[PDB]
Amino acid sequence: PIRLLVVSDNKPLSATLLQCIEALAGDLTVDVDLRYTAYNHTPQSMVDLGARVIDVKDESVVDLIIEHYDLVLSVHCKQLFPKRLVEGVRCINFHPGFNPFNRGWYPQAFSILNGLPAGATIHVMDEAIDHGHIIVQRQVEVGSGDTSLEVYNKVVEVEKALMHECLADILQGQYEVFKPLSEGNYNGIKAYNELCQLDLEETGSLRDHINLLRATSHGDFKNAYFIDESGDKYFIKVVLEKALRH
């Protein structure tokens, strides 16, 4: 009877994970707790799935997790698991990036700027961020027309496909792991906020400037901004459309 804690700030991936587990209840008994984190400013969609808050950095919560669970799954979790937690119980992260490339924040946004692989990685969690040995990953192609939104949605679909394909093996420990070929590059939220903070005076190719806007364009999120002569702040995004082929 596998005791599973899922720690997630993402409703659609959590819903998919709960459905995959329910579909396995014929061959494999799993007791699931679902939790979201303190950083979730807008948690009602998780609450609707039966979740409540966990502070994974709280030392008593760490004690209790190591006691009560065989396995912790991090799915788009907004909190750093502390050292004693990842060394105390098996912790596996679903990361919307292709490790070890653009580890950290909004990987597909950096992949649009720098050409590094985009995709999804399921990996063992160590003390470092998006850093432990890889269980499985799959690349997504970044199209010329894509913004952050289109690449992110393809990454989320690939994560759902990996859950469906691999969840039985992950729950049962039936897999080998591989060390990333290098440490790779890490992007913190500071590096993203500097992307968003446009310099109207900066000089570059139209390509680099369009790529910067594409990286920061994500549906209705207010990301990239300039501030004009009168100190008015304007958010800017690009919208792209493939021309009809005739």
Next chain:
Amino acid sequence: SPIRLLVVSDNKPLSATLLQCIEALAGDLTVDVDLRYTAYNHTPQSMVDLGARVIDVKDESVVDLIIEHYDLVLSVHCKQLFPKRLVEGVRCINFHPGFNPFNRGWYPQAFSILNGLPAGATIHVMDEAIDHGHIIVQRQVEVGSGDTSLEVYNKVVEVEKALMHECLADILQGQYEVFKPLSEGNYNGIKAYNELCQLDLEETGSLRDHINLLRATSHGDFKNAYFIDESGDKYFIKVVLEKAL
């Protein structure tokens, strides 16, 4: 003897506003209106809904029947250049969505976003050259730092309607001091706008310059600016801006 007015227009909203301003005068000074859309208008349903029919203002038989049968011709956002024998044959007056003589010709607010020259609306007597003649009334519109072609254009269209409510009586009745523009500023053809739309991804400049090119070529659902990637796939690109709340 009612004023025999020819309105040539390919724009329904401005034509709607003009007809409305005219019946507001119905009481005091009377007008016989013929409303026409140009032979260069291939989607004229919105003008037909206003009771308009086609005029080809380059058909010599048509320009004959014009000089004989009207006192005044109003051009309001019409897709044809008026011949010489027409514009001398009558008082021909144009409603221009630019602040003459800056960015005369096509889509003025687009070129104003690029080159920072004033934008707005100009009612000008029509001479031989495009958007050149002596100016009756004009109003600048503010180019907001967050505005695209669409926002500036909509501000110009409202000023054009304002100028119609304020100035039409005096325009139909000759009641104005026309003036020469302090210079002849600059003209922009359809070529120059399509050259903006054909983005060069290798071109180098300020992010300000690049954002201003996208803003200039962004206009709601019109497919304007585009690039072609390595595989030869074409993508249209626009910018969408929002003042912070």
